[PDB]
């Protein structure tokens, strides 16, 4: 049973998430994903969510007063507050496993140059906060990261949704001049397992030497 609240100035970005959820899991109360427009918590007629960076520099910074009100409303002391950021700790499968048993995730999606640091710092005085990066590339905001996190976590929640894996094959046995490796059709399952293990080792050496 997990509640996920996502806060964003682009609520439509998260439409695929609510789409990918099977009715049975929602009906069984296993998962609830809610998306909130950050501008609900703006103070002014111009619905401002950003402002110039102290110390100067390019880009804009999201306002702490707006974010503070939104998180005040949405979070509780039991919330795990997830803040995507290119400067975050790495989000890995181990993280996804850990978060998969949480009762309440709140994902705060930044835009522009990010969120005033006091927002996370204030939140961390009364709840668990996790600033996380999903990889070593730069996005325009947290929304695509939220999609990735939500998918990786929820597929580990029952019934809701190391070396590298080697190549996989299915029918037909021959296609465009390329045969499925004969060992796979051999019925020697010890040999198949060893062949797969060796494929995995080779692929890891070639693609991800860092894992070795």
Residues in the annotated binding site for adenine: 134-135, 137, 139
Tokens 């695509």 belong to residue: 144
66 scored as a contact of ligand JDQ (CB under 6 A): no
Q: Is 168 left (phi over 0), alpha (psi -120 to 50) or beta?
A: beta
Binds its own copies (CB under 8 A): choice among 1, 101, 117, 202: 117
Based on its alpha-carbon atoms, the radius of gyration of the chain, rounded to whole angstroms, reads: 22
Q: Which residues contact 45 (CB under 8 A, 6 or more apart)?
A: none
Positions at the binding site for S-adenosyl-L-methionine: 84, 110, 133-139
Cα–Cα distance, 130 to 66 (Å, whole number): 20
User: What is the C-alpha to C-alpha distance for residues 99 and 90, in angstroms, rounded to an integer?
Assistant: 14
**Which residue of 113, 159, 194, 205 would you call a contact of its own copies, by CB under 8 A?**
113
Write each residue from 36 to 75 as x if it is in contact with its own copies (CB under 8 A), else as -, in one continuous string: --------------xxxxxxxx--xxxxxx--x-------
Which is closer to ligand JDQ, CB of 22 or CB of 135?
135
What residues from 15 to 34 belong to the interface with its own copies (CB under 8 A)? 15-16, 19-20
Determine which residue in the list 53, 86, 166, 181 makes contact with ligand JDQ, applying CB under 6 A.
Answer: 86
Tokens of 89: 């700790």
Q: How many CB atoms are located within 10 Å of the residue 147 CB?
A: 19
Helix (H/G/I), strand (E/B), else coil: 162: coil
**Sole window of 65-73, 96-104, 109-117, 122-130 interacting with ligand JDQ (rule: CB under 6 A):** 109-117
Q: Binding to ligand JDQ by residue 199, rule CB under 6 A?
A: no
Question: Measured in Å, how far apart are the chain's first and last C-alpha atoms?
Answer: 37
Residue 113 lies near ligand JDQ (rule: CB under 6 A): yes
- What is the total count of residues that contact its own copies (CB under 8 A)? 82
- Tokens standing for residue 1: 């049973």
Applying CB under 6 A, which residues contact ligand JDQ? 84-86, 110-114, 133-135, 137-142, 145, 165
């Amino acid at each position: 049973s997990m509640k996920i609240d996502v806060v964003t100035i682009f609520p439509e970005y998260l439409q695929p998430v609510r789409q990918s959820l099977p009715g049975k899991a929602i009906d069984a109360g296993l998962v609830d994903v809610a998306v909130h427009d950050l501008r609900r918590w703006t103070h002014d007629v111009h619905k401002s969510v950003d402002d110039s960076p102290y110390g100067g520099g390019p880009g804009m910074v999201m306002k702490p007063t707006v974010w503070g009100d939104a998180l005040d409303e949405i979070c509780t002391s039991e919330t795990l507050l997830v803040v995507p950021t290119p400067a975050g700790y790495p989000f890995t499968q181990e993280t996804a496993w850990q978060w998969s048993t949480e009762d309440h995730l709140v994902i705060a999606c930044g835009r522009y140059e990010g969120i005033d640091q006091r927002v996370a710092d204030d939140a961390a005085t009364r709840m668990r906060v996790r600033e996380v990066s999903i990889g070593d590339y730069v996005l325009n905001g947290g929304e695509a990261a939220a999609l990735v996190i939500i998918e990786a976590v929820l597929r580990l929640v029952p019934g809701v949704l190391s070396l590298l894996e080697g190549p996989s094959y299915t029918r037909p046995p021959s296609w465009r001049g390329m045969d499925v490796p004969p060992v796979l059709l051999s019925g020697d399952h010890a040999k198949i397992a060893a062949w797969r293990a060796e494929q995995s080792r080779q692929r890891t050496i070639e693609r991800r030497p860092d894992l070795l």
